[PDB]
Design a protein around this ligand. Structure first.
Ligand SMILES: *Cc1cc2c(cc1C)nc1c(=O)[nH]c(=O)nc-1n2C[C@H](O)[C@H](O)[C@H](O)COP(=O)(O)OP(=O)(O)OC[C@H]1O[C@@H](n2cnc3c(N)ncnc32)[C@H](O)[C@@H]1O
Ligand code: HEC
Ligand SMILES: [Cu+2]
Lengths: 124, 75, 393, 124
């Protein structure tokens, strides 16, 4: 069904100066009305995180059905035909990010997943 | 002559030494002038669909196709 | 008994040696190559993609002596005595020639991409000469952890096998897709266009969607500097890091051609377009990648093609007859995936003293079905086994 | 030899809203008059880094000596005569980024060492 094949920003730590959008690419197209994307800026532990496994651990805590959580959600206007670009008006501030989805293909199958990254600031 | 040999030599590049294919691409050796010429021209105009034979066949004139045809069957 | 000495046992030389004996079996033909064996750069992408090993693309030259009576010398040619019509070897011995065929292939320009000298090739392999390097790069791809980035940096024209880097991407992708699906490929190109671009990109979209990013020179794809220590490539669009990086530097003619004075300013060898006799040292012929052959790509098929015309021309010159009118062909097959093949193909013809493609030449059709791609894949393997049979059977 | 035994921020990705203080703890005390400390926001590769080994590699091209480089220096104030505990200040807080602290230090044992510490400041 609808798996993620590529993401921008990549699953890496990056200098994404004022990142105003996140771009996702799926294996086949994805039905708009029925599919929901949410993005969370991660609140990292006191001790911090030592690697990407731990960031991916920290993101898998989240999900589309998630009400109370440690992390701060971000307002994204979505634009869906297999590439999705989540938009924010405001440029995103520095942070470890998670994007999370429930996504309907045209065969009626649902697929959930996440894509996490670290935006480490920088300037225009 | 060397003229015909050079026109023909390149066919062995894909079709194997003196038309003996190791496989995939068909063999050439067990065919006579007439068959070769008649299908070169067939590939050339489109009559016979090719993956690459028209690209190659179109590179030759009708005269050269006859030389090539002769030389492969003779050899 | 008249003598022809051929330098090199690759696509050009071995084909030349065989055809020389076919055209005049009265010649004392000696072919000189450092080794009893030859590994093909063609199909080495399938080694990188873990479909075969180096043995399966290595061939014995012995057949040339055993069957076609070409004396096979396993030495390096160090020097060419043009006047004394002799060739000096690494062992100090000499071998005399009435006519010399030089087909040495390519060397990598070590002074061209800042950072990339002979020492950089262990960490940042080119693998544009096959064997040791192919092996090094594959071992890198095997050790790379899932989720890593392979960087492929092809050079500006002209270079050996213009689609080659894009098939390399394709097949590395094939290996990544089945073993390391998170992994990414990033092409940092010096050029704003590549061979069979439409075809490769459609192939990538359908076999490896999202795996492969291509950055042209015009968008800051050009490699200005590399750091072999750190897996870092420097470009006008910024610094990039690769977990594996395949840097492919600009190229020129093999040492023997350069050192002997057969090459001109460009680092390639100008040659009579009809006879492939060197426009610089009479009685030496230059074929293959080392030659300047008009329209003809620096490809294995071209070398083999040039070899035939050349054999004919040297027998012409040795028996005091005018050279004949020549014919060539070249076809570069690329495997986008093991069962997805594409081709660029042409027949060649002298036209105003320049080598030129005939009408009809072209790349595989744009809007074709899966069966078509599968067939061209089958035919690529056909070509490979066939052409090597011709050279080494 | 004065080696780094501990540091804050530690070697990780951490949310550190207003970071003004970098702390180094060395294995022996260290001579103020003959010790230098510098600090840089690392300008990451375009496609970013994927772990801390890559942070370190990148950080290690710097050192107390370096001149012009890809990276951007952050002016610091040492707070120390002899001490195993070095504390580094900036008046304003630090923007988010990957940072490298590089030193040359005289131990009380008389030996000079150089070294670096790197972390990723995610914001907060
Ligand atoms: C790197 C590459 C090349 C390539 C390809 C894919 C890759 C990854 N795919 C191809 C394809 O699909 N179709 C095709 O037609 N060509 C393809 N190529 C290109 C092909 O490798 C080259 O264009 C071809 O090798 C050129 O032939 P040439 O004869 O010009 O060069 P060579 O085969 O490397 O042979 C040179 C030999 O001579 C020996 N040598 C060199 N100098 C000396 C001296 N001084 N003394 C003695 N021997 C010498 C070399 O050792 C070598 O064996
Ligand atoms: C002279 C230079 C050449 C002659 C004469 C022929 N060829 Fe080829 N050839 C090639 C392929 C892959 C095929 C299968 C058809 C296709 O998909 O395009 C062929 C087919 C032929 C046939 C028909 C054989 C049959 O048994 O039906 C004939 C008579 C033939 N070819 C003659 C490949 C190539 C190639 C690849 C690089 C070259 C240079 C040539 N052929 C050249 C000649
Ligand atoms: Cu000490």
């Amino acid at each position: 069904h609808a798996h993620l094949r590529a993401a921008d920003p990549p699953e890496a730590i990056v200098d994404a100066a004022g990142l105003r959008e996140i771009r996702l690419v799926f294996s086949e197209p994805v039905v708009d009305r029925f599919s929901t994307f949410r993005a969370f800026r991660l609140s990292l532990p006191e001790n911090g995180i030592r690697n990407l496994t731990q960031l991916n651990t920290l993101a898998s805590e989240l999900g589309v059905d998630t009400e109370e959580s440690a992390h701060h959600e971000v307002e994204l206007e979505s634009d869906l035909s297999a590439e999705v670009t989540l938009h924010s008006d405001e440029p995103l501030p520095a942070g470890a990010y998670a994007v999370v989805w429930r996504v309907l293909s045209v065969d009626g199958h649902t697929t959930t997943g996440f894509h996490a990254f670290v935006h480490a600031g920088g300037t225009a | 002559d060397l003229r015909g040999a050079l026109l023909a030599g390149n066919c062995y590049g894909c079709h194997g030494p003196n038309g003996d294919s190791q496989g995939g691409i068909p063999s050439l050796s067990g065919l006579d002038a007439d068959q070769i010429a008649e299908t070169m021209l067939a590939f050339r105009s489109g009559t016979r669909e090719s993956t690459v034979m028209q690209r190659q066949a179109s590179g030759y004139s009708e005269d050269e196709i006859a030389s090539i045809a002769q030389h492969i069957a003779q050899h | 008994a008249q003598r022809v000495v051929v330098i090199g046992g690759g696509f050009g030389g071995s084909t030349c040696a065989r055809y020389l004996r076919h055209f005049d079996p009265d010649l004392e033909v000696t072919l000189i190559n450092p080794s009893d064996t030859y590994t093909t750069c063609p199909f080495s992408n399938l080694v990188l993609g873990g479909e075969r090993d180096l043995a399966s693309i290595t061939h014995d030259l012995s057949q040339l002596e055993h069957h076609h009576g070409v004396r096979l010398v396993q030495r390096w040619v160090e020097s060419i005595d043009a006047d004394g019509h002799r060739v000096v070897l690494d062992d100090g011995s000499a071998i005399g020639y009435d006519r010399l065929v030089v087909s040495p292939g390519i060397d990598l320009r070590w002074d061209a991409v800042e950072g990339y000298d002979q020492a950089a090739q262990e960490a940042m392999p080119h693998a544009w000469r096959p064997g040791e390097q192919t092996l090094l790069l594959r071992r890198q791809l095997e050790a790379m952890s899932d989720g890593g980035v392979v960087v492929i940096a092809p050079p500006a024209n002209p270079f050996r096998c213009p689609p080659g880097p894009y098939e390399r991407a394709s097949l590395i992708a094939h290996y990544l897709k089945h073993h390391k699906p998170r992994s990414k490929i990033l092409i940092l190109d010096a050029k704003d266009a590549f061979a069979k671009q439409g075809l490769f990109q459609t192939g990538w979209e359908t076999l490896y969607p999202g795996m492969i990013e291509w950055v042209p020179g015009i968008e800051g794809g050009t490699v200005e500097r590399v750091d072999a220590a750190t897996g870092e490539v420097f470009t006008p669009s910024g610094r990039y890091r690769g977990d594996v990086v395949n840097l492919i530097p600009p190229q020129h003619a093999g040492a023997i051609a350069r050192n002997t004075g057969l090459t001109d300013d460009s680092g390639w060898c100008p040659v009579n377009q009809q006879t492939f006799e060197s426009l610089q040292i009479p009685h030496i012929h230059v074929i293959g990648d080392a030659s300047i052959a008009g329209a003809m790509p620096k490809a294995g098929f071209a070398a083999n093609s040039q070899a035939k015309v050349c054999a004919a021309a040297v027998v012409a010159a040795l028996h005091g007859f005018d050279p004949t009118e020549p014919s060539w062909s070249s076809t570069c097959y690329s495997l986008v995936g093991p069962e997805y093949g594409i081709s660029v193909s042409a027949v060649y013809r002298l036209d105003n003293g320049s080598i030129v493609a005939s009408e009809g030449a072209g790349v595989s059709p744009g809007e074709a079905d899966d069966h078509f791609r599968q067939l061209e894949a089958v035919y690529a393997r056909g070509w490979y086994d066939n052409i090597t049979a011709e050279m080494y059977g």
